[PDB]
Amino acid sequence: ATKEGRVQKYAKERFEALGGLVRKLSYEGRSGAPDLLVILPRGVIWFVEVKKDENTKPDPHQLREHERFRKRGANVFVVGSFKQVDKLIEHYY
Amino acid sequence: ATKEGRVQKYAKERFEALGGLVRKLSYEGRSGAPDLLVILPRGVIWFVEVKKDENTKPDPHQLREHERFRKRGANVFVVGSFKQVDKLIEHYY
């Protein structure tokens, strides 16, 4: 697809293999929502932003939105390659 | 505003008074997302659907989506009056 699209599809497949529900998120009347909402068993909720490669940072409005979430304790992760998806699961799940 | 709009605004204000971040949610290319994502301190995540009155049930696609979330342990609540917002906070927070 697109590079970003391929990483997103892999992530979706890995999370669904763990029993997770994956949704593509957007906000009504606001930008900056994380690309994926991931609902994993036992009430684990992850918000995952997907980028095209490991050197691509999220844009400024995205970064401020991730920090608003994390200040309150929410799980927000950024991945930009298949390896990063694999490390996220290994280390955080 | 609309009845549903007034309850939604009250809910937003009550959650923001607890330190919460409130967002109006939508999905890309899918319907049925809960009306509100609420991120409360200490990583508490609530999805809240708001209706115009206490007798209005969510539509069928919404109900199936709430159950997909709750099967995995997520917090999904439906409120349709100011009193229900108040009871939700009293009982669940």
Residue numbers in the entry:
A (entry chain A), B (entry chain A): 2 to 94
What text does the study give?
However, we were able to solve the first VRR-Nuc domain structures using single-domain proteins derived from three bacteria and bacteriophage as surrogates: Psychrobacter (psNUC); Streptococcus equi bacteriophage P9 (stNUC); and Salmonella enteritidis typing phage 3 (saNUC). DALI searches show that the structures with greatest similarity to the VRR-Nuc domains are all Holliday-junction-resolving enzymes exemplified by Hjc. As dimers, bacterial VRR-Nuc domains have two active sites and a DNA-binding surface with 2-fold symmetry that are well suited to the recognition and symmetrical, bilateral cleavage of Holliday junctions.
saNUC was solved by molecular replacement using the stNUC structure as a search model, revealing a dimeric arrangement of two molecules in the AU essentially identical to that seen in the stNUC crystals. By contrast to the other proteins, saNUC only formed nonspecific, higher-order complexes. stNUC and saNUC exhibited weaker nuclease activity against the Jbm5 HJ substrate, detectable only at protein concentrations above 1 μM and with increased reaction times. Under these conditions, stNUC showed robust activity, whereas cleavage by saNUC was much reduced. This suggests that our saNUC preparations have a low active fraction potentially also explaining the lack of structure selectivity seen in the gel mobility shift experiments. Whether the levels of activity observed for stNUC and saNUC are representative of those in vivo is unclear, but it would appear unlikely given their close structural homology to psNUC. Crucially, however, both enzymes retain the ability to produce symmetric cleavages within a HJ substrate, an activity that is not characteristic of VRR-Nuc domains within the FAN1 orthologs.
